Structure 1
Amino acid sequence: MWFGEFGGQYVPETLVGPLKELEKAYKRFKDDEEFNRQLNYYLKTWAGRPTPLYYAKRLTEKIGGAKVYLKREDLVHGGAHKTNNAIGQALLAKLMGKTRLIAETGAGQHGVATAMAGALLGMKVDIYMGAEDVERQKMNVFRMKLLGANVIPVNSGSRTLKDAINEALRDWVATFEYTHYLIGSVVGPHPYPTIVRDFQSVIGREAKAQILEAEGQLPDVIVACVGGGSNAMGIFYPFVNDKKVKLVGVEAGGKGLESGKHSASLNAGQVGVSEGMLSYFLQDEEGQIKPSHSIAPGLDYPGVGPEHAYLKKIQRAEYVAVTDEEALKAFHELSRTEGIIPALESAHAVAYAMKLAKEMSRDEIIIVNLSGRGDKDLDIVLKA
């Protein structure tokens, strides 16, 4: 339940039971030969795992320092790492005997991932989306409708991801008998942060095998973008006990850390309770959760996963920020140099890895998690 001083189950007594059952179900199926066979089969034949580890020779040679490798989560079915978790929790829910999936979404990528997995396994999908996010993401809303999922708009509060998350929890209390709440990051009450991380750990496990095969050694640095922290925990977790491997999470620096217009929870936030967890949250002087900003909608969350809060306190992972402008330059650079259009979320990771590569030895190795493809982001890259 706890990652050092961070995490927990900060929920009403109505949710304690549901989460008890979820936890008992996960303990059972986590190691069940049939669950893991099914999960592995769907990840291989349906998602297209294992994703490749691509050596960006031209980017590497242009910067003239560290070998830059890209973990290509952009190539997974749906175009984002979110599919790995979406499949895992939908299979669990199915085996738990649930018939309906509910999910929060802000970017819409978790909504699409939940809708695909719900369509794959023949479950009803209800996507609680902030009313502001629905109008922001008209195309992703259409994809979800084509996949057979209903977008239920959340009109409460900031009408964003925070509000969508709590509306969904209020439904789950009523519906938990026949419904699994499918959380799309390493956030929320226990056991969600552990489950989401366990289902994203496949990224790191592949990437470790692939970098040992390609270079015959572990990476010097692993760089991943952090919204809630699922793709980052995914690639980090298997290297956590490899002490020489440096872990760097890149949060949304937005319009600048000094601007107040960002999502860098771990850089600028204060320890607090929201969405049923004890973690770093952007807070005003009064102590209320402040609004977040990122050009990358997937990094636009005021909070961060508790396990990242733990990794920051023990100083196992360093957390940095990249601005909207640095991310945009990286979006263009990776496109022109490697013919790969990265998600704006992922372009944060690429932006920091490029600055870090320049300062580093030619023999040294950076793995960047390329969390998604940028097809969904072309309109906003156009506007800028």
Structure 2
Amino acid sequence: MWFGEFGGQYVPETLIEPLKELEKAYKRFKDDEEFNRQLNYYLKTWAGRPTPLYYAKRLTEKIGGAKIYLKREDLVHGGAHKTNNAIGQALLAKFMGKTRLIAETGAGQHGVATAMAGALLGMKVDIYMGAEDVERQKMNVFRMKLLGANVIPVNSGSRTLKDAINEALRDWVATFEYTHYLIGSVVGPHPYPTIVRDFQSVIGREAKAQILEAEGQLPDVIVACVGGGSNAMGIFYPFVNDKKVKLVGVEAGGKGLESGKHSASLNAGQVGVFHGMLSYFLQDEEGQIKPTHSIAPGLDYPGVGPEHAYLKKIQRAEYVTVTDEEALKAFHELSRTEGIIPALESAHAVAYAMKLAKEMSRDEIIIVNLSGRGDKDLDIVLKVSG
């Protein structure tokens, strides 16, 4: 439940029974033979795992420093690492005898991944999405509708991701006998931060076997962008006990930390309690969630998962920021140099990796988690770049 002092189940009594039922169900099925056979089967045949580990030779030789490897989660079905968590939880839901999935979404990518997994498993899917986000993400909403899901606009509060989460939680109180609430990052009340991290750990376990194969040793640095923190946890977690391996999470620096338009919860936020968890959040002086910004829509959650707050506190991982402008340059650079169009979220990790590689030697090794592909972002980049 806790990662040091972070985490918890900060919820109404009305949620304690669904959550206890979830943890009981998860404890049973996490190591169940049939559950893991079925999970691996869908990950392999439907999602396309394992994803490759790619040596960005041209990018590496251009910068002239450490070897830059990319964990290619951009090749997973759907175009983002989120699918690993969507399948895991949707199948867990099915094993629990649930016939409906609900989920929050802001950028729309979790909604699409949930919709995909619900379609795969023949479940009804209802997606809660703040009206501001429904407006900004027409194409992802359309994907969700194509995949058979209902998108429910959320008109309360700030009409955004934080409000979608709260409305989903209210649905779940009424409907948990037949509904599973599929949370999209390593956030929320226990047992979600653990479950989502466990379902994403496949990334780091594959990456570990692949770097040992390609290079004969562990990497010096693993770099991943941090929205809520699931892609980063997925790749960090199997290396947590490898003391040589440096872990770096990259948050959205937006227009710059001094501008106030960013979403760097760990670098600039403070401890708080929202959405059932004690963690770091960006808050106004009255202790309410403040507006956030990033060019990458998957990085604009005002909080971060408790397990990252923990890793930062104990100094196991370093957390840094990259600006909109730096992300955007790395988006173009990776496209031109390696023929891979990254997600704007992932481009943050690429931008930082490029800076870090320059100060390191040519025998040292960086793995960047390329969390997604950039097709979803082409409308944004066309407007802001040209």
TM-score (norm 2): 0.99
SS at match of 2:80: coil
Distance 2:175 2:342 in 1: 37
SS at match of 1:211: helix
Distance 1:375 1:170 in 2: 33
SS at match of 1:295: coil
Once the 2 structures are TM-superposed, how far is the Cα of residue 286 of structure 1 from its aligned partner? 2.6
SS at match of 2:315: coil
Once the 2 structures are TM-superposed, how far is the Cα of residue 283 of structure 1 from its aligned partner? 1.3
| Mean CA deviation greater in 329-338 or 281-290 | 281-290
Partner deviation per Cα, 1:68-127 (whole Å, 9 max, x = no partner): 000000000000000000000000000000000000001110000000000000000000
Partner deviation per Cα, 1:221-278 (whole Å, 9 max, x = no partner): 0000000000000000000000010000000001111111111000000000001100
SS at match of 2:376: helix
5 Å-filtered alignment, 1:3-22, equals: 3-22=3-22
1:90 equivalent in structure 2: 90
Distance 2:151 2:174 in 1: 19
SS at match of 2:151: strand
Distance 2:331 2:150 in 1: 32
Partner deviation per Cα, 1:39-64 (whole Å, 9 max, x = no partner): 00000000000000000000000000
How well do the aligned residues superpose, as a CA RMSD in angstroms? 0.5
Once the 2 structures are TM-superposed, how far is the Cα of residue 292 of structure 1 from its aligned partner? 1.1
Distance 1:192 1:87 in 2: 14
SS at match of 1:173: helix
Distance 2:200 2:139 in 1: 26
2:100 equivalent in structure 1: 100
Once the 2 structures are TM-superposed, how far is the Cα of residue 284 of structure 1 from its aligned partner? 1.9
SS at match of 1:156: coil
Once the 2 structures are TM-superposed, how far is the Cα of residue 288 of structure 1 from its aligned partner? 1.9
Once the 2 structures are TM-superposed, how far is the Cα of residue 287 of structure 1 from its aligned partner? 2.3
1:120 equivalent in structure 2: 120
Unmatched runs of 5 consecutive residues or more in structure 2:
none
SS at match of 1:360: coil
Identity of aligned residues (%): 98
Distance 2:28 2:293 in 1: 39
Once the 2 structures are TM-superposed, how far is the Cα of residue 291 of structure 1 from its aligned partner? 1.3
Structure 1 ranges of 4+ moved more than 6 A: none
Distance 2:77 2:152 in 1: 24
1:233 equivalent in structure 2: 233
Distance 2:63 2:325 in 1: 19
Distance 2:195 2:259 in 1: 34
Distance 1:89 1:289 in 2: 28
SS at match of 2:125: strand
SS at match of 1:165: helix
Partner deviation per Cα, 1:113-164 (whole Å, 9 max, x = no partner): 0000000000000000110000100011111111000000000111111000
Distance 1:190 1:256 in 2: 33
Once the 2 structures are TM-superposed, how far is the Cα of residue 285 of structure 1 from its aligned partner? 2.4
SS at match of 1:44: helix
Distance 2:83 2:242 in 1: 27
Distance 2:192 2:230 in 1: 11
Distance 1:346 1:123 in 2: 30
Matched, 1:72 2:72: yes
Distance 2:257 2:217 in 1: 35
5 Å-filtered alignment, 1:324-335, equals: 324-335=324-335
Distance 1:117 1:177 in 2: 20
Partner deviation per Cα, 1:180-207 (whole Å, 9 max, x = no partner): 0000000000000000000000000000
Distance 1:43 1:334 in 2: 27
1:175 equivalent in structure 2: 175
Once the 2 structures are TM-superposed, how far is the Cα of residue 301 of structure 1 from its aligned partner? 0.5
SS at match of 2:70: strand
Distance 2:332 2:307 in 1: 32
Aligned residues: 384
TM-score (norm 1): 1.00
Once the 2 structures are TM-superposed, how far is the Cα of residue 11 of structure 1 from its aligned partner? 0.3
Distance 1:170 1:303 in 2: 20
2:366 equivalent in structure 1: 366
Distance 1:139 1:5 in 2: 39
Once the 2 structures are TM-superposed, how far is the Cα of residue 289 of structure 1 from its aligned partner? 1.5
Distance 1:318 1:31 in 2: 31
Distance 1:185 1:174 in 2: 22
Distance 2:130 2:285 in 1: 26
| Mean CA deviation greater in 95-104 or 281-290 | 281-290
Distance 2:136 2:32 in 1: 41
Distance 2:280 2:255 in 1: 20
